[PDB]
Amino acid sequence: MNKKTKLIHGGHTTDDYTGAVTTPIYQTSTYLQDDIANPTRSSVESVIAALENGKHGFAFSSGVAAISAVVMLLDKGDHIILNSDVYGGTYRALTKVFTRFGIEVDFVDTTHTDSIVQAIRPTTKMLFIETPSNPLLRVTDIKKSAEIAKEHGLISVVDNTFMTPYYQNPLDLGIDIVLHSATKYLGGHSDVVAGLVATSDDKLAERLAFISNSTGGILGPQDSYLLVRGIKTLGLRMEQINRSVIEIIKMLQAHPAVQQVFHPSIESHLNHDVHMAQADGHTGVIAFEVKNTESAKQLIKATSYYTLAESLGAVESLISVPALMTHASIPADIRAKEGITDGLVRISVGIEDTEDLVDDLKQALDTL
Amino acid sequence: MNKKTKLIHGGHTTDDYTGAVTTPIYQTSTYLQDDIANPTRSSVESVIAALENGKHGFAFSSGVAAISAVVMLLDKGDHIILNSDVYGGTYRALTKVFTRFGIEVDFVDTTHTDSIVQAIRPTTKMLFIETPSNPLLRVTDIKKSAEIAKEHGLISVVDNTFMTPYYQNPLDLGIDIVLHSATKYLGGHSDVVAGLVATSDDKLAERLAFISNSTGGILGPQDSYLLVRGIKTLGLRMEQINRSVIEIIKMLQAHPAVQQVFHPSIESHLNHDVHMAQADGHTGVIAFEVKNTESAKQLIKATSYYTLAESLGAVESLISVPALMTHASIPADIRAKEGITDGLVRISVGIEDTEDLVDDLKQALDTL
Amino acid sequence: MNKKTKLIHGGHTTDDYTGAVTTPIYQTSTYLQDDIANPTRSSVESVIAALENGKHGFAFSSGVAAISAVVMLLDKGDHIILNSDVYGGTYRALTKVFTRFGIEVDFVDTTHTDSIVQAIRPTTKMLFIETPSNPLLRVTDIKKSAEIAKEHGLISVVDNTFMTPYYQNPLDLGIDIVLHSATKYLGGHSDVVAGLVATSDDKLAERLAFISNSTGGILGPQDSYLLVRGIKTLGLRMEQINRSVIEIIKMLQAHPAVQQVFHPSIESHLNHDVHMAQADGHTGVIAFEVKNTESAKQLIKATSYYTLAESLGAVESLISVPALMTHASIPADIRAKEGITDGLVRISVGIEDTEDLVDDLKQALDTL
Amino acid sequence: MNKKTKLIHGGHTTDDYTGAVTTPIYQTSTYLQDDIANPTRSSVESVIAALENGKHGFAFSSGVAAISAVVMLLDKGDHIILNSDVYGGTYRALTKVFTRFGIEVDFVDTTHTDSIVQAIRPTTKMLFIETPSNPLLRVTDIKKSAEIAKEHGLISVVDNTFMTPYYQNPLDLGIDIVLHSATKYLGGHSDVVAGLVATSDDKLAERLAFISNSTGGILGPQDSYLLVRGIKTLGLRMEQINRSVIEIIKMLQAHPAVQQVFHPSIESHLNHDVHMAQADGHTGVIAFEVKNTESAKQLIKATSYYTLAESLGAVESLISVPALMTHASIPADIRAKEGITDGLVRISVGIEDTEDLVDDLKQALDTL
């Protein structure tokens, strides 16, 4: 069964009782028992488990809540390894919340697999990896990270948001736990805040169930329905997005006002071979450098189809400046040391017409 | 402005943009900014803050998530005091999750105020109190607990679910943080899983905001709308429920098949004076003893308007046996030591006709 | 089974499949059949049929659509009798739409039963009656109108919106078809636009089904759920509203700035005996006269809890001036001839505190 | 601005007040005015007007309600011309409802443009055309029908459901009114029952507004939101569907168990040139003949990805037998006279993998 077919018929998204072709929305809190588990959420959990070739699905009220639940698998004193370019909510939550509970985090450049091995302490219990990462799209060898984690008794976790289960399946490569900010591509319509988590480990799933039930970050039934609905067009949107990405990159790495381009499809990109060995396609997130901050602001204004926004994975294309929005708290020269130059622009390719998206960026790049 | 009026006009539950008399449902995840916080949830947070005479409201995906967020105000090594008859999700989460993060919990019979003072360690940071508690409805002196907590530098938290803000306002009595399982009376229609938290402390609210944003247990916009909608009839439902409670208790403490009755309205009930000094009315939860487990099961079957269910605060009345449902894991003789006798029945009074609810219980009690 | 109990347990509003205590929301358009009718709407139709002691329920996308469907029971050439003080959507639709299809309408003062008999033509097929009517609250003898209609072979229809099924049951008095603008009291929260229609006639119900299916004005599943949810508090809201009505009228017929008061509870009101003989209570709609248009506008501004709005049956109380809003198209002196004086005010009593609602009106009436 | 871009940015589907990227859902019935039109529905009406290059949009509670509203533009005595192969709800409503109101309907084979001219009576006021029609997909010359209608003073109406506005724009060809059963492709997810109507005529739109407001078949705000959401992927779904259609037809017109194939893409299909002159693509509906009824039932059972269902325009592919389902009421030999042979199968191509959909049908056709 090919990929686009699995999105329509994978999982259980119908009603056995009435034959309804869509999951009923169970706005309800209690269920009567004949004598002395929301079905809408059970449907979306069934979908993510199917799409990731897992056995168990979990739906949280946000990607942040999904990550928080996974971290709570550890106790005080345990160490977790992350890719060093993590930022945003994940870095913020681990360093400013979970360290207060004795959970210690060590950031590691995981683009080199052996860096993970050097960082393993006797108290390390979890290896958490984003690939590709944000905003420079560093690629990490999923299959080797799984082998390292298994050989050292580590719970392996991959944030698969940027690739979606349509292009990258970490569970197939031996990873223990895969998770998504379903707010992005999975929902795909900028109208659901949600997290999704899949696993095949019976015992890890049981621990995840207890944590979720004891900390209460559950996804509501209305959001669960909108998630299932949006996932049904995941393959059509990702393929359209991938089509535009290839053409936009060709435009980008040929325009005089564009210096460096960051995307795993580029052959000179670090670990480009590794990405192709673990993925079927590409994320819609691209980063590129213009001359300076002044040019980046002009680019956003001259652009007609790129909306200035912070998120990604929408139907409409999004544009942003990391150095001005997500990394304005980091000192200016530390930004440069890690690549977040003042003229670095990030775009999230939507599902508009490919030629419209290529020409709109060029006519704006021509204004510099 | 009297109470029933405040439920209709307290908080901000209209749309300034269009004049809509109800809060628009913002199924959305990102908001565009002109140049380089969900309004539906902001509405329900505005309501609970108003109803509790607080300054800041917070809406979580469940009461469990609300409690979890409040506990995360502490660090590893901090101690929290609870009323010793806590059970269910709150006890389960504190003892099986948060102890793994070095947060130590000490249970205390808070029906005696001075018991709190004996239990205060140098590492105690929080005092968490349910009143009335479950299922025997023990009453705790809110005002004195607030004085103790303030005098010792303790964050004071009251679970106000059973009374609702319509009858008991812990913030008015000096408590730092008040919280609810909005799944119960506030939503009131058995169709929303939600938590609500109110405070007047600017600094506590700021810490709560960071925790909520870093752990992601947020209430969805559709559930937030249904919460605001249900709260609008809170006073009408609580007053109808209170009307039935008084009559049912009179029936209960006069029937030969009924031994002990547990409810704070009874004058011989422990701290009955204290409850009246801090409350305007009563919870719809009542506990009473029949002869044995056999009689309790017959009572549930002979009853026509009491539905066998686990929850409370619905429009329909609910019946359950704690020793068989919520406390079947505790050994049989420890149950007896704490009052959970095998023939103890708990009911949640709904909004059916009062005479219908009194006569239905009696005709069932007459079958024993 | 008393009234408040029937609102909670009448009809079928649970899920047999899962035991859910609330009706699942079936956002769906097609249902699979094993080999070669929306349950959410079927639930609300079950409720209105139960509440009106009918056999068949129908849910339309608006009260206008409900009335339109009922009128389409007739063919070109058929005559329908209405109470002469009909206006708004019903009058507008019959005179400006259905007359173009050869359906002829005759308005009749039905406060006198024998007026109906004089108006019966050989081509009369339907008798349509609002009681109490708008905005002067004229009362029509339901039981006698049913006898007249049956004796002459007329389909009898009563618009029961103002009384709701909680206080008036036209089907019990022999009427063929009863209908509501569920937008008002039934939904009760100013957030659902809906119509409801109940009947016991098997053959009339079959014709209604065909019309509804052939003209497509069906109520959606989300609105159907919110309708069922709102009806559950109908008795609590109507009784609170009735409590405020009695006190407000006592205030009104004793204030010097108030001339005539229109409400069926007043003993000098026309057919006051008839209303009490067919009803258990009162509508929340009241009309009263101040001196002039200038005073009416001041009254609306000086009022703190009465919101200037056009609708009725909300949780918040509403105030309006018919001569300025619903009847500004009728010439000035025809308004006077029918009682719509320039200082006539109409209020829809909500569920705020009774004393708050009485004192707020008086302090505003004192400003004149 | 190319087509896929217009689906994302055409119309107004954001919130000016907050900057929300999706239309707020206005569950509300009344809007307050400062001193003496649902925005969610206004959004979907804005979209269909934009997508069809019209000036005015209208959203109804069903396609049936949309058609009913359009027919009510006429008075008793007026004649309407339809394509003779209309059936289902449209034929049923016109012949069994609107004839009772003196609206006379004349069916005409409109595949020949001059047939319309012969059928024009002095009382003809409207020309209503489906193209392609159901289930044999007859094609009608839209541009010539518009010229005929304008030359004779006829309101021209095209049911554009099968093509969607992505492939066929009747307003651009001079048609007065275009309408859709948005339940099908526009919503596209089998979860919204809705009609949509667009026009550029200021006066026709005004009459449509009055009819809609006087008959009340309005689309709810929740359904309006789900409609806007589904339309955003219209181009991606239609193009995927069109891709599968071309390949399935090639498979179909080469399999020994398949006799006649009905689809406008086939060059021998009647008016194939006309369709290409007025359309950019194709509908997903295909009809083909197997040997007999026995083979058709085997085909449905042997098929793995075609679901036995009555509707069309879903994400999953659908299969049905007209002679057994939609035309079982017509006598057996009249079916043959009009082409509805007992072995005629109709499919609605979904968005599954193209190769999966071609191979699944062949392996099932091979079982005969």
Side-chain angles (χ1 to χ4, degrees), chain C residues 285-297:
Chain C
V285 173
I286 313 177
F288 58 95
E289 307 190 353
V290 285
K291 206 163 105 163
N292 49 19
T293 280
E294 283 334 298
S295 296
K297 301 184 80 133

Side-chain angles (χ1 to χ4, degrees), chain A residues 27-30 61-62 64-65 72 74-76 92-93 100-101 190-191 213-217 226 297 310, chain B residues 27-30 36 61-62 64-65 72 74-76 92-93 100-101 190-191 213-217 226 297 310:
Chain A
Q27 276 293 337
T28 194
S29 77
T30 166
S61 39
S62 65
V64 163
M72 284 176 135
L74 312 187
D75 307 334
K76 59 163 186 302
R92 174 197 232 182
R100 304 194 283 102
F101 303 141
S190 292
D191 57 359
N213 176 269
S214 291
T215 47
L226 289 168
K297 301 184 80 133
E310 47 283 69
Chain B
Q27 276 293 337
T28 194
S29 77
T30 166
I36 216 154
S61 39
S62 65
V64 163
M72 284 176 135
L74 312 187
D75 307 334
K76 59 163 186 302
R92 174 197 232 182
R100 304 194 283 102
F101 303 141
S190 292
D191 57 359
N213 176 269
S214 291
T215 47
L226 289 168
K297 301 184 80 133
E310 47 283 69

Side-chain angles (χ1 to χ4, degrees), chain D residues 139-215:
Chain D
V139 174
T140 296
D141 193 319
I142 300 168
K143 202 200 173 313
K144 276 182 176 177
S145 310
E147 295 163 355
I148 295 182
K150 181 194 169 63
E151 200 214 325
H152 289 86
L154 275 37
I155 305 169
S156 49
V157 187
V158 174
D159 191 334
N160 198 32
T161 304
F162 272 30
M163 294 313 299
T164 84
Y166 192 75
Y167 287 134
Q168 180 166 264
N169 298 120
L171 297 185
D172 285 346
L173 305 163
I175 297 295
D176 291 320
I177 298 178
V178 71
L179 63 82
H180 303 257
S181 172
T183 313
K184 318 305 184 206
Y185 287 108
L186 283 163
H189 292 69
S190 292
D191 57 359
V192 190
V193 168
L196 291 178
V197 176
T199 187
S200 295
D201 197 298
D202 286 330
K203 189 46 211 312
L204 285 177
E206 178 181 9
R207 300 164 59 187
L208 272 179
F210 189 95
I211 282 149
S212 165
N213 176 269
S214 291
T215 47

Side-chain angles (χ1 to χ4, degrees), chain B residues 299-364:
Chain B
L299 197 59
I300 303 181
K301 166 140 62 83
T303 207
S304 282
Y305 303 132
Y306 296 75
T307 296
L308 168 72
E310 47 283 69
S311 203
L312 65 105
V315 293
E316 54 275 296
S317 303
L318 308 178
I319 196 161
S320 70
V321 188
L324 274 62
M325 299 169 59
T326 54
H327 291 62
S329 289
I330 285 177
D333 310 62
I334 288 291
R335 284 197 235 113
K337 185 123 90 177
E338 260 156 344
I340 315 303
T341 78
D342 294 305
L344 184 73
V345 187
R346 193 197 70 169
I347 52 163
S348 180
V349 170
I351 64 171
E352 301 102 326
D353 189 71
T354 297
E355 264 165 39
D356 274 3
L357 287 185
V358 175
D359 303 356
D360 185 47
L361 250 203
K362 215 163 90 140
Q363 70 86 16

Side-chain angles (χ1 to χ4, degrees), chain D residues 254-331:
Chain D
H255 199 278
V258 171
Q259 291 136 264
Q260 302 304 271
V261 184
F262 303 94
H263 190 276
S265 58
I266 300 155
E267 203 133 16
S268 62
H269 193 89
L270 168 63
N271 277 340
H272 158 84
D273 291 358
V274 169
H275 177 85
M276 303 269 95
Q278 60 195 19
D280 265 5
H282 292 105
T283 180
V285 173
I286 313 177
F288 58 95
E289 307 190 353
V290 285
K291 206 163 105 163
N292 49 19
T293 280
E294 283 334 298
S295 296
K297 301 184 80 133
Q298 166 65 20
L299 197 59
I300 303 181
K301 166 140 62 83
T303 207
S304 282
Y305 303 132
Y306 296 75
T307 296
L308 168 72
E310 47 283 69
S311 203
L312 65 105
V315 293
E316 54 275 296
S317 303
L318 308 178
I319 196 161
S320 70
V321 188
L324 274 62
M325 299 169 59
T326 54
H327 291 62
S329 289
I330 285 177

Side-chain angles (χ1 to χ4, degrees), chain B residues 26-346:
Chain B
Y26 278 81
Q27 276 293 337
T28 194
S29 77
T30 166
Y31 304 76
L32 306 184
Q33 318 298 332
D34 269 315
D35 200 355
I36 216 154
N38 183 280
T40 316
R41 189 168 67 255
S42 293
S43 186
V44 79
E45 294 170 347
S46 149
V47 169
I48 194 59
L51 291 184
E52 290 282 16
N53 305 327
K55 191 182 173 181
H56 310 281
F58 298 88
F60 293 90
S61 39
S62 65
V64 163
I67 296 189
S68 171
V70 170
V71 162
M72 284 176 135
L73 291 163
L74 312 187
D75 307 334
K76 59 163 186 302
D78 294 348
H79 275 84
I80 168 176
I81 299 179
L82 275 84
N83 50 288
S84 58
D85 50 1
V86 292
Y87 208 62
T90 314
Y91 164 88
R92 174 197 232 182
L94 274 172
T95 61
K96 312 280 321 199
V97 162
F98 288 102
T99 53
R100 304 194 283 102
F101 303 141
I103 294 180
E104 280 321 304
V105 46
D106 286 305
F107 308 92
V108 163
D109 198 334
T110 62
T111 56
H112 212 304
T113 279
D114 284 344
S115 298
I116 305 166
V117 180
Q118 180 186 329
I120 288 175
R121 306 163 181 259
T123 51
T124 305
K125 298 283 166 280
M126 177 173 286
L127 172 62
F128 187 105
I129 283 164
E130 309 170 332
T131 175
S133 52
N134 183 74
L136 301 193
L137 298 140
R138 295 192 172 88
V139 174
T140 296
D141 193 319
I142 300 168
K143 202 200 173 313
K144 276 182 176 177
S145 310
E147 295 163 355
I148 295 182
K150 181 194 169 63
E151 200 214 325
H152 289 86
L154 275 37
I155 305 169
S156 49
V157 187
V158 174
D159 191 334
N160 198 32
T161 304
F162 272 30
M163 294 313 299
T164 84
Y166 192 75
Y167 287 134
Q168 180 166 264
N169 298 120
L171 297 185
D172 285 346
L173 305 163
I175 297 295
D176 291 320
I177 298 178
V178 71
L179 63 82
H180 303 257
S181 172
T183 313
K184 318 305 184 206
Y185 287 108
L186 283 163
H189 292 69
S190 292
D191 57 359
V192 190
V193 168
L196 291 178
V197 176
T199 187
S200 295
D201 197 298
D202 286 330
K203 189 46 211 312
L204 285 177
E206 178 181 9
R207 300 164 59 187
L208 272 179
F210 189 95
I211 282 149
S212 165
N213 176 269
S214 291
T215 47
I218 60 179
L219 188 65
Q222 190 69 48
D223 294 291
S224 303
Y225 177 73
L226 289 168
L227 241 192
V228 160
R229 189 184 201 263
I231 287 175
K232 300 199 169 297
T233 56
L234 177 68
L236 300 193
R237 292 182 285 105
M238 294 309 290
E239 285 182 4
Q240 172 70 27
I241 286 171
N242 269 231
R243 241 133 47 210
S244 302
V245 154
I246 295 305
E247 298 307 307
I248 289 172
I249 284 176
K250 275 156 68 181
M251 187 277 301
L252 225 42
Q253 62 198 348
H255 199 278
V258 171
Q259 291 136 264
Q260 302 304 271
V261 184
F262 303 94
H263 190 276
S265 58
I266 300 155
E267 203 133 16
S268 62
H269 193 89
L270 168 63
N271 277 340
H272 158 84
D273 291 358
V274 169
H275 177 85
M276 303 269 95
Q278 60 195 19
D280 265 5
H282 292 105
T283 180
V285 173
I286 313 177
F288 58 95
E289 307 190 353
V290 285
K291 206 163 105 163
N292 49 19
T293 280
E294 283 334 298
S295 296
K297 301 184 80 133
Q298 166 65 20
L299 197 59
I300 303 181
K301 166 140 62 83
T303 207
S304 282
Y305 303 132
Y306 296 75
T307 296
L308 168 72
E310 47 283 69
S311 203
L312 65 105
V315 293
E316 54 275 296
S317 303
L318 308 178
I319 196 161
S320 70
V321 188
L324 274 62
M325 299 169 59
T326 54
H327 291 62
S329 289
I330 285 177
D333 310 62
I334 288 291
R335 284 197 235 113
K337 185 123 90 177
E338 260 156 344
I340 315 303
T341 78
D342 294 305
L344 184 73
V345 187
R346 193 197 70 169

